[PDB]
Amino acid sequence: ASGIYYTPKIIVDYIVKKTLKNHDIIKNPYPRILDISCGCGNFLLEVYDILYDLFEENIYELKKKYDENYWTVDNIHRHILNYCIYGADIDEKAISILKDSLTNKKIKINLFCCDSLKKKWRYKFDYIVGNPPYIGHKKLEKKYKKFLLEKYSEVYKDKADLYFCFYKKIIDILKQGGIGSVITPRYFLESLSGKDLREYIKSNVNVQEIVDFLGANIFKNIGVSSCILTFDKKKTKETYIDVFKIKNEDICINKFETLEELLKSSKFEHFNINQRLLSDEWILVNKDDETFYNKIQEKCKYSLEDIAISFQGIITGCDKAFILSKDDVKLNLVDDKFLKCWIKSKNINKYIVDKSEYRLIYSNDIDNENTNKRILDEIIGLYKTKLENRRECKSGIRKWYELQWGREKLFFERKKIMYPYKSNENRFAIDYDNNFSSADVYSFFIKEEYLDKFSYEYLVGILNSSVYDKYFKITAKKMSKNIYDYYPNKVMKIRIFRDNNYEEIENLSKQIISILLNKSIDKGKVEKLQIKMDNLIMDSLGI
DNA sequence: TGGGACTTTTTGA
DNA sequence: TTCAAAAAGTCCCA
């Protein structure tokens, strides 16, 4: 809740250098560089140093070209503090610290203590740098969210993040021909909520460079994945984007004195993306991956959304009140008609699900409060207060002992395919035990009209293959290190096929399932069967 | 302290 | 009425 995050000095140096590398101080000796979330001025002090070097090295040229008495080395500090540096933040103390630092670098200092999203900006800016705040839909005040929805509807909507509005504000107050460079989360590149935002960035600025750190850790002790976006508003004929994607997420960012050394090394991969060819999604991949993805998309006639019905797991609202161990003695109080098997994301393997260790009390079947009063008095009631603070319980839609978002039972108590919402690899398992789960596991079942065309065994055989792992990870949402988001908004967009290899792929999947379900489970032959199935799928897809 | 295993429920629509 | 997205994730240990 402090609101101030230290951006590493390497990133700050890289961003400032990216914005001010090729600035013609002779042509324009009055550049306006702004940081709308400056905090203690990590970016602004480096901006001051760079500007001081520029002015000191061109002071005599400026003196000849302009007022001789005005352009002096002794007057550089005052000029920079008067006409060049602009900062804004909400923290009074951080603004005071930055003001003290700028004063002690050697006068009206242009530092503002306000909300940058509400401030009426009196002029546009040549350069904009900084690190905006990241606040999700849970940790954001509701009235402020209403304000954002009312005024920033072009980029902010539904489950959008706060920094979308900061992106929009940076684009709005950027002078024509100006350059902006910021560090933000990487999720908006692939997230559904970022769609509108991406469109905005596509339709108002030219994207110069995207530095994607994927799942690395740039901020110490902070669970966020970061990217650096550099863009301009110049008159460009061809709009191409230099995309730099990290290859090894196990790095210490201080491996080099400069970020450019890391970018131009074997630790990063560079390619080019045509901005005019960008779709609703931004598919930032190299030529090989692009050809692979296009070949898979063309060769497949169906998608999972076409043939399957998907749903999210139960949302109890308070798991500690409804989930218990199968060996718990309190379960003797509850009849088996109210008990469902309960699995977690770690219980999902590639083809089969681990046997259930937990039981869920489906309290929605409790008809009368007086009946089964022992269960409410000794199990569910222990968290009654918490259960009463849920949104649907304050409004009277749910009884305090009911599940907040208990779905239809008929969807879970059937044969279906389940997969964790976050994983390092594809894990699509067939559930035979009518397992219930929380939102950490998503489920789907084949529509009855496609049962003859696609079976569960074939689907899990092709989905768990390395080919489809790579194919899904092309457009997947990279959350953290070795973690991808497996949500319906991208899982249901996977495209599938059927051809002459359907029978052998299904048979190999059945053999793998049979081996995995045996007692003396030696998974060695499973790998060989998987390799054979991968070769079959690669032959089928022409790759 | 840094790195790996694992993942709740609040929330807008 | 009731769906599904969202990591400035969360938590523990050598």
Numbering used by the authors: 26 to 131, 141 to 577
From the study:
Accordingly, we purified CamA-DNA complexes and grew co-crystals, using a 13-base pair duplex containing a centrally-located A:T and with a 5′-overhang at each end (either an A or T). The complex crystallized in space group P212121, resulting in a structure determined to a resolution of 2.68 Å. In the crystallographic asymmetric unit, there are three CamA-DNA complexes (A, B and C). The CamA-bound DNA molecule undergoes major distortions at the 6-bp recognition site (labeled as 1–6), while the unrecognized flanking sequence maintains B-form. First, the bound DNA molecule is kinked between base pairs 6 and 7 (the joint between target A6 and the 3′ G7) and bent ~30°, resulting in the largest movement of ~23 Å towards one end of the DNA molecule. Third, the π-stacking force in the non-target strand is disrupted by Tyr455, which is wedged between T5–T6. Fourth, the target A6 is flipped completely out of the helix. Intriguingly, in the CamA-DNA cocrystal structure, we did not observe a bound cofactor in the SAM binding pocket next to the active-site, even though exogenous SAH was added during initial complex formation.
CamA-mediated methylation at CAAAAA (underlining indicates the target A) is required for normal sporulation and biofilm production by C. difficile, a key step in the disease transmission, as well as for colonization in animal models. The basic surface of the cleft between the two domains forms the DNA binding site with residues from both domains approaching DNA from opposite directions.
